[PDB]
Amino acid sequence: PQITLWKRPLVTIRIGGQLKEALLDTGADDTVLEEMNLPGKWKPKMIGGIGGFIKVRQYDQIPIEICGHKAIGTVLVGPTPVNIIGRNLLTQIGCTLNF
Amino acid sequence: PQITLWKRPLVTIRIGGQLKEALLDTGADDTVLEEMNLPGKWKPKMIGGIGGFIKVRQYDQIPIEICGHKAIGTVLVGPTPVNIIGRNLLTQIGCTLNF
Ligand SMILES: C/C(=C\C(=O)N[C@@H](Cc1ccccc1)[C@H](O)CN(Cc1cccs1)S(=O)(=O)c1cc(F)c(F)cc1F)C(F)(F)F
């Protein structure tokens, strides 16, 4: 697919039994999802952007389906205002910038 | 160009005759540059990111050449962690996401 940027590049993602709308975000190194109580081990982390830092929980090797494409990797879970698909998973679904 | 996402999509920009490195950021609605001097009238604005809200200075109709492509639009100056080119200018240079 090709996604123009007139509007936010929101797409439907699936993580287990939850479907969410998430930004395809080339400006994010890592994937950050809204608060959710995922199973398994995790580690605490601080992540920073505009406005400062929030505390997240890092879960590894989490399968996520993005627009019907399979990905699996690290997801950061915390009080983000928007779900964010970062470069760690964008590469896995074959995503590039073109102009 | 086609830009893959295994590395940060940093490009050279030219603004007011100065060369800077900026991140192509599809998750950003706006273009935000670190503290710098720009000529002309500006107005105070507030924007919200992952960590909360910040105050920025809004400059309108500023030319930036982004990786050899011309844009003229709104540039916000303030405490961003990194210079980011947002959708307001990404659309001007014909940037799309593809996978
Ligand atoms: C405020 C703006 C952009 C912005 O913050 N963009 C981030 C995505 C976002 C949008 C709206 C609300 C919250 C977050 C960036 O595209 C991604 N950021 C990175 C930024 C780069 C430049 C500024 S913020 S990040 O802070 O969210 C971020 C930080 C991490 F440490 C991380 F691991 C993952 C992330 F997504 C705007 F450009 F002014 F609109």
Side-chain angles (χ1 to χ4, degrees), chain A residues 25 27-28 30 32 47-49 84, chain B residues 25 27-30 47-48 50 81-82 84:
Chain A
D25 191 354
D30 303 311
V32 194
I47 58 167
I84 295 165
Chain B
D25 187 0
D29 297 342
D30 304 318
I47 57 168
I50 200 165
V82 59
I84 46 164

Side-chain angles (χ1 to χ4, degrees), chain A residues 1-3 5-9 24-27 29 49-52 54 69 87 91 93-99, chain B residues 1-3 5-6 8-9 23-27 29 49-52 54 69 87 91 93-99:
Chain A
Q2 179 173 93
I3 294 163
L5 299 165
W6 292 117
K7 67 179 178 69
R8 292 167 169 149
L24 304 179
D25 191 354
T26 62
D29 300 340
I50 285 172
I54 63 170
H69 293 234
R87 291 186 301 100
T91 59
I93 69 168
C95 193
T96 58
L97 286 162
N98 303 79
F99 58 101
Chain B
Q2 171 159 257
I3 300 170
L5 298 172
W6 285 284
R8 291 176 188 246
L23 185 63
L24 302 177
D25 187 0
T26 59
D29 297 342
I50 200 165
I54 63 165
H69 290 254
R87 295 188 299 97
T91 55
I93 67 168
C95 188
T96 62
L97 285 167
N98 303 264
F99 57 100

